[PDB]
Design a protein around this nucleic acid. Sequence first.
RNA 1: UCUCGAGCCCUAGACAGCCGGGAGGUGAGCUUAGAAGCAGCUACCCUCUAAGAAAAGCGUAACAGCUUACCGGCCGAGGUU
Lengths: 70, 29
Amino acid sequence: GVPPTAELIKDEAGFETGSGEPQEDFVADLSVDQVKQIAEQKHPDLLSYDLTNAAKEVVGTCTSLGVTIE
Amino acid sequence: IPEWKQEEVDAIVEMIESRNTLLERALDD
RNA sequence: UCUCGAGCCCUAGACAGCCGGGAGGUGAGCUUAGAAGCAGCUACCCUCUAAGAAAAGCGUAACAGCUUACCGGCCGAGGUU
């Protein structure tokens, strides 16, 4: 239903591509609340019961693209 | 006497309060 | 084929075989018209959970498909280096 994570990130990031080599080349960034919103849009797609873990899954694709958090 | 087996028997007993062999072990407890 | 020694695993059920499970975020990013476990390059992270790799091997033009790891059951005595 709701579009894939890789895309939902590139929107609130402002960047279109990821990184040639992740965690070594920081491309995009993300605040905590911004990730809370993304955690809400993928409730059906994710298996996590709490919004706590729901975040962790999204937060699990970011750093592997060069998406730092603050 | 593997440790992970002991940690499971505990975890099971923990849910009982609040592998089939490991379930029975916990029931007995 | 016979004999002797060492280590490790095992009734909290080992070795094997058979059955069942092998799940989601996600067909990871990049690259590429496309690449979705599996052309290449980088990374290889978290959920549900009793398991389940950013996939060990075949397979596809690419998907699919077939299984490997891993978990559970049946079985029951030694097994393995």
